[PDB]
Amino acid sequence: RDEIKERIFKAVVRAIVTGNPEQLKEAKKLLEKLKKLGRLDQDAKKFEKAIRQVEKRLRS
Amino acid sequence: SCPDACCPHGSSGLRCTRDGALDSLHHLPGAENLTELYIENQQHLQHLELRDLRGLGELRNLTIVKSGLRFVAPDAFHFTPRLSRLNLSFNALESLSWKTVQGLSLQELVLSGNPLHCSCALRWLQRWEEEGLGGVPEQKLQCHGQGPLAHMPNASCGVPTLKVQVPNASVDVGDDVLLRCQVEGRGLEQAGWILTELEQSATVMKSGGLPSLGLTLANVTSDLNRKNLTCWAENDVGRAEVSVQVNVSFPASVQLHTAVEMHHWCIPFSVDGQPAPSLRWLFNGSVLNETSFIFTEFLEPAANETVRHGCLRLNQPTHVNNGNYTLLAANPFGQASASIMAAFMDNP
Ligand SMILES: *[C@@H]1O[C@H](CO)[C@@H](O[C@@H]2O[C@H](CO)[C@@H](O[C@@H]3O[C@H](CO)[C@@H](O)[C@H](O)[C@@H]3O)[C@H](O)[C@H]2NC(C)=O)[C@H](O)[C@H]1NC(C)=O
Ligand SMILES: *[C@@H]1O[C@H](CO)[C@@H](O)[C@H](O)[C@H]1NC(C)=O
Ligand SMILES: *[C@@H]1O[C@H](CO)[C@@H](O)[C@H](O)[C@H]1NC(C)=O
Ligand SMILES: *[C@@H]1O[C@H](CO)[C@@H](O)[C@H](O)[C@H]1NC(C)=O
Ligand SMILES: *[C@@H]1O[C@H](CO)[C@@H](O)[C@H](O)[C@H]1NC(C)=O
Ligand SMILES: *[C@@H]1O[C@H](CO)[C@@H](O)[C@H](O)[C@H]1NC(C)=O
Ligand SMILES: *[C@@H]1O[C@H](CO)[C@@H](O)[C@H](O)[C@H]1NC(C)=O
C-alpha cells in the first residue's frame, strides 16, 4: 500500500531533520503492516535499512 | 458497603454516603489515582475549598449532592484539572462563580435542585444554556425567586471587552515592539498579559495600567515568531482574552542531510527565514530541472515554528545523478546555501 509507504517515508524524514527517534517507532510499526500486505515487495528491505541507518546516526 | 464513610467502588472509584467523606478520602492510600468520586449527606460541607480536593489529579467524575453545599471557592477545582463530569445538584448553592469551572473541559455540569439566585454572576451559566453546553439546557434551571434562567434579563451583564494594539508591519531582529491592550467593562477585577514561554525571545517590560496596559518586547529575536501574546481581563461576569502574534523578519538558513534510500530516495533538508525563503536546487553548479522523478517535496508546516523541512525526492536515480547537490534558499535578506555529495548507483 502506497499510503503506508508514504507514512513510513515521512516518519523517517522527520526523525532525520528533527533528530527525534520517537518518529522511528512509528515507522517500524507501519513497516510490519506493510510487510504483511505484500511479502514480495522489494521496497520493505529499503525501509528497514533506512530505519536502521537513521537510528545509528541518532544513537551515536 | 464497608465500615468507613467512604467505600471503594470499581477499579478507581470511591462512594461516600455518610458524614466525613473528606477526612476519609484523605486517609485513603492511592486516592490520587481515583477517577470517580461520589459524595452525599455531608453535614459540614457548607464550603468547598481549594485544599478539600487536593491530590485528586486523576478525577474525571465528581458528584457532591445532598450535602448543604453553599459556597464553592473559585479555585475549588484547581487540584482536579481533568474533571469532565461535575454534579453539584441538590445542595444549597445560591450562586456559582464562573471561575470555579474555568479551564475545565466539562461535558456535564449538573446544578438541578439548587436555589440559584440570578444576577450578572450567573450570566456565564446562561451562556452555557444558550450554547448547549454541559447538559445545562435539559436541566431547565430556574432563578429561584424569579423565572427560568433562559429568560434572565442580562443587558447590564458583560465580560470585559479588549482591544490589542499591535504593529501592522513586520519588525527586524533587535527591534523594540510596543503593544497595548485597552480594556473596557463594568466592575473590572484584574487584567494582564499571558506570554507563552518566550524562551527569552524578547525582554519583557510592562508599563502603565488600566484602562490601557502597555507591553514592550525589547531586543526581539527571530524566535518571537509564532509566540502567542495574550491580553486578558476579568470581572464578576467572566473573562475575555485576545491573542496576537508579532512577525520578526530574519535571514534565510538551509541545511542538508545525507541521502537515504526508501521507495524513493530522499535528500532531506531544513530551511528557515522570514519571509519564507524561495528554494532552488543546483546539481554540480547548474540549475537542477525538477521532473516527475526528481522533485522537491515539503513536510507539512508546523504552527509553532517557522522552519520548514522536506526532501529532494529521487525516483530510481542512476549514476548520472551522482554529484554535488546544492540547495539555495533566498529571501529579502539574501541567499543562503548548503551543499552535499550524493551517490545513488555505481558507475557502469
Ligand atoms: C446528579 O446527581 C443526582 C443525585 O442527587 C442524580 O439524581 C439521582 O439519580 C439516581 C440514579 O437514577 C436516582 O437513584 C434511583 O433511585 C430509585 C429509588 O427508588 C431506584 O429505584 C433507582 O434504581 C435509582 O437507584 C436518585 O433517585 C436520583 N436522586 C434525585 C434526588 O433525583 C442525577 O441523576 C445526577 N445527574 C446526572 C445528569 O447524572
Ligand atoms: C497512581 O498515581 C501515581 C502518580 O500519582 C503513579 O505513580 C502510580 O503508578 C499510579 N498507580 C496506578 C496503579 O496506576
Ligand atoms: C464517568 O461517568 C460516565 C457516565 O456514567 C461513564 O461513562 C464514565 O465511564 C465515567 N468515567 C470514569 C473515569 O469512570
Ligand atoms: C442574553 O444576552 C444575549 C446577548 O446580548 C441576548 O441576545 C439574549 O437575548 C439575552 N437573553 C435574555 C433572556 O435577555
Ligand atoms: C540583544 O540581544 C543580543 C543577544 O542576547 C545581545 O548580544 C545584545 O547585546 C542585546 N542588546 C541589548 C541592547 O541588550
Ligand atoms: C558544489 O556546488 C556549489 C554550488 O555550485 C559550489 O558552491 C560548491 O563549491 C560545490 N562543491 C564542490 C566540492 O565543488
Ligand atoms: C514545536 O512543537 C514541537 C512538538 O511539541 C516541538 O518538538 C518543537 O520543538 C516546537 N518548536 C518550537 C520552536 O517551539
Author numbering:
A (entry chain C): 1 to 60
B (entry chain A): 35 to 382
Question: What did the study's authors say about this model?
Answer:
The design of proteins that bind to a specific site on the surface of a target protein using no information other than the three-dimensional structure of the target remains a challenge. Here we describe a general solution to this problem that starts with a broad exploration of the vast space of possible binding modes to a selected region of a protein surface, and then intensifies the search in the vicinity of the most promising binding modes. We demonstrate the broad applicability of this approach through the de novo design of binding proteins to 12 diverse protein targets with different shapes and surface properties. Biophysical characterization shows that the binders, which are all smaller than 65 amino acids, are hyperstable and, following experimental optimization, bind their targets with nanomolar to picomolar affinities.
We succeeded in solving crystal structures of five of the binder–target complexes, and all five closely match the corresponding computational design models.
